[PDB]
């Protein structure tokens, strides 16, 4: 189970991490903690 972020965490900030899953889905996989 290997996933990698491919976004600026900046985008998956606390404000979009639990708001913009569009990043926190599989863009900020680890970065947020969703993969």
Curated annotation (Swiss-Prot):
One of its GO terms (cellular component) is extracellular region. Coiled coil: none annotated. The record marks 7, 9, 11, 20-21, 23, 27 as: Important residue for binding Kv1.3/KCNA3. GO terms for molecular function: potassium channel regulator activity; toxin activity. Disulfide bonds join 3-35, 12-28, 17-32. Its main location: secreted. It comes from the Eukaryota. The record marks 22 as: Key residue for binding both Kv1.2/KCNA2 and Kv1.3/KCNA3 (occludes the channel pore like a cork in a bottle). Negative results: does not show or very weak activity on Kv1.5/KCNA5, Kv3.1/KCNC1, and Kv3.4/KCNC4 (IC(50)>100 nM). Peptide with both antimicrobial and neurotoxin activities. Inhibits voltage-dependent potassium channels. Potently blocks Kv1.1/KCNA1 (IC(50)=6.7-87 pM) and Kv1.3/KCNA3 (IC(50)=10-250 pM). Less potently blocks Kv1.4/KCNA4 (IC(50)=0.31 nM), and Kv1.6/KCNA6 (IC(50)=0.16 nM). Shows moderate activity on Kv1.2/KCNA2 (IC(50)=9 nM), Kv1.7/KCNA7 (IC(50)=11.5 nM), and KCa3.1/KCNN4 (Kd=0.03-30 nM). Blocks Kv channels by binding to a shallow vestibule at the outer entrance to the ion conduction pathway and occluding the entrance to the pore. This is Kappa-stichotoxin-She3a.
